[PDB]
Enzyme design. Structure first.
Site, PDB file in Angstrom:
ATOM      1  N   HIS A 169     -13.168 -11.785   6.232  1.00  0.00           N
ATOM      2  CA  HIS A 169     -14.465 -12.660   5.480  1.00  0.00           C
ATOM      3  C   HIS A 169     -15.429 -12.885   6.768  1.00  0.00           C
ATOM      4  O   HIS A 169     -16.537 -13.373   6.234  1.00  0.00           O
ATOM      5  CB  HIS A 169     -14.066 -13.853   4.618  1.00  0.00           C
ATOM      6  CG  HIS A 169     -13.674 -14.900   5.365  1.00  0.00           C
ATOM      7  ND1 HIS A 169     -14.417 -15.747   6.249  1.00  0.00           N
ATOM      8  CD2 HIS A 169     -12.484 -15.596   5.373  1.00  0.00           C
ATOM      9  CE1 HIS A 169     -13.682 -16.838   6.665  1.00  0.00           C
ATOM     10  NE2 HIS A 169     -12.550 -16.673   6.147  1.00  0.00           N
ATOM     11  N   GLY A 198     -15.456 -23.910  10.625  1.00  0.00           N
ATOM     12  CA  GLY A 198     -15.444 -23.279  12.100  1.00  0.00           C
ATOM     13  C   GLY A 198     -14.006 -22.939  12.582  1.00  0.00           C
ATOM     14  O   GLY A 198     -13.737 -22.162  13.598  1.00  0.00           O
ATOM     15  N   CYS A 217     -11.571 -21.043  10.945  1.00  0.00           N
ATOM     16  CA  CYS A 217     -11.217 -19.932  10.495  1.00  0.00           C
ATOM     17  C   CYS A 217     -10.551 -18.981  11.408  1.00  0.00           C
ATOM     18  O   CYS A 217     -11.342 -18.823  12.317  1.00  0.00           O
ATOM     19  CB  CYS A 217     -11.963 -19.064   9.332  1.00  0.00           C
ATOM     20  SG  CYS A 217     -12.518 -20.158   8.096  1.00  0.00           S
TER      21      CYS A 217
END
Ligand SMILES: FC(F)(F)c1ccc2[nH]c([C@H]3CCNC3)nc2c1
Ligand code: NA
Lengths: 301, 301
Positions: B41, B143, B145
């Site tokens: 993503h 932040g 991920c």
């Protein structure tokens, strides 16, 4: 979201752990520049520890008596000297993995990460707080001595702890990296015991703030209080006194959430008096006191 | 002595965290050999999160649309391929810090360490369990991920989790390093919610055994239970069914402490009924379910 007991990444410190063996006894050492730091009780036998003269025991030993292993590589001891309760071993090679570092002495109530090891081999890391009674509730088995506690501020590792002993209560006692013990302890096999512990009040408040940030708000109430009235409560419930500095330190949290420190102290006051009434806070049924205000701010920002 | 939620030393994973930027989105990546792994993503824009067509968004990207930054060094991307929900970016430089590693998908109940990262820079390490509802109870700010979960068995790092998103209940969802999500979650910002969580029964029992091993016996009793009667009662406290596999797995802890598995099951049954009446077990006021039988044996022995 989320709140966990969280340790500093241990990489910078893993690269400094070495095995130090003297006679039969073997424990962990910290390798920094060209010195290996470890507990001076490495030079003692079972009888020695009953009443050691470390200056006398150390002068008997010599460089070759200390087997120092950095993983599979051997390190050659070219010098040995004692500072307080840590033994300093000069080695021929400087640690190429030496990070930027300071030796710091922490205050009871401050937290640090512990890299527990066994045979100079790091096995686990966890977060600790220096208890008010100057012990730490760690997890240590035989072979852990010389494990170190540390904080990282920017790039700099601040070494603050070295593990020396377990106490009969199952908690632990150690020194700063200058060999000064935390608490009224001596590196000797005698009758030693942890004093009565108290709860780190500023840390409990910090964690209540961490709770509010994460959506746990049920314990908040309309009331406020004063330092004097609260410390009467704190003293009643074996909590450290809350000082004006603690209130200042909690400044950012009191603004980020709109709950004033004495406002939150009213929450803790009622929590101490009436208990938790079946509810939890951040998944805990105990009031958690091993998070500093800095800890809360750093994990929530 | 002591029992702490201990994470693995994170240094081997630290040397792998990089920053991946795509458009205005920056998250973390895992740099192993010449491949950088990160959540796919990262290529999603604002209008994409609801119904992103990942093949369509990816076919439109060139290699130079991916900025990979390893510390201060910029890594040049030489290819990219999507595997399930992770992006695999070919970079021209192999990671020299690449440890022994392997990718394993873990089952609910399993524990692992998490290295929380932001801007490809490790922030902290903590220990987690895969909940029965396939979420984890992490600590993740925006932040983080691409932060990864792992175990370290004999110097080999088994990567088992990559962080992808936070469900509305504050818990977290992610994939194995093959990009297969844990549980029924998708990398779409449509309303999806975690199944009702349960307590990991085999883990609570292991932790009870750990408490006996560290010398705490107050919760035992003189009763036993059949396996099925235990499960009929445990289901009513939202506990995971306990299986014969779970009983076999506990066999070594049963034999080490002298307490048959079903006897410890009777103890837990009573604990669930009575609460703890103000006592604690290994220092917690709740029954802990994020220590596995393997973890207990490796921290105690
Ligand atoms: F209190 C203390 F100083 F930590 C301490 C207490 C007993 C010890 N026994 C030993 C080795 C020699 C015999 N077994 C290991 N070192 C010790 C250190
Ligand atoms: Na209030």
């Amino acid at each position: 979201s989320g709140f966990r007991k969280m340790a500093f990444p241990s990489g910078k410190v893993e690269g400094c752990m070495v095995q130090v063996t003297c006679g039969t006894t073997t424990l962990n050492g910290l390798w920094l520049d060209d010195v290996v730091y470890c507990p001076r009780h490495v030079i003692c036998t079972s009888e020695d520890m009953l009443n050691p003269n470390y200056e006398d025991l150390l002068i008997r030993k010599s460089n070759h008596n200390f087997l120092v292993q950095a993983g599979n590589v051997q390190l050659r001891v070219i010098g040995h000297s004692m500072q307080n309760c840590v033994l300093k071993l000069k080695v021929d090679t400087a640690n190429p993995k030496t990070p930027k570092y300071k030796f710091v002495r922490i205050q009871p109530g401050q937290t640090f990460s512990v890299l527990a090891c066994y045979n100079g081999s790091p096995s686990g890391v966890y977060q600790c707080a220096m208890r008010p009674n100057f012990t730490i509730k760690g997890s240590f088995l035989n072979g852990s001595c010389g494990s170190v506690g540390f904080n990282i501020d920017y790039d700099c590792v601040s070494f603050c702890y070295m593990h020396h002993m377990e106490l009969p209560t199952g908690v632990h006692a150690g020194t700063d990296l200058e060999g000064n013990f935390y608490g009224p302890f001596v590196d000797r096999q005698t009758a030693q015991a942890a004093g009565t512990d108290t709860t780190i009040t500023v840390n409990v408040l910090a964690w209540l703030y961490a709770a509010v940030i994460n959506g746990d708000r049920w314990f908040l109430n309309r009331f406020t209080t004063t330092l004097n009235d609260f410390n009467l409560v704190a003293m009643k419930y074996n909590y450290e006194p809350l000082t004006q500095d603690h209130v200042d330190i909690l400044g950012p949290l009191s603004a980020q959430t709109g709950i004033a420190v004495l406002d939150m102290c009213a929450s803790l006051k009622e929590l101490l008096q009436n208990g938790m009434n079946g509810r939890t806070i951040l998944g805990s049924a105990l009031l958690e006191d091993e998070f500093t205000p800095f800890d809360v701010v750093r994990q929530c920002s």
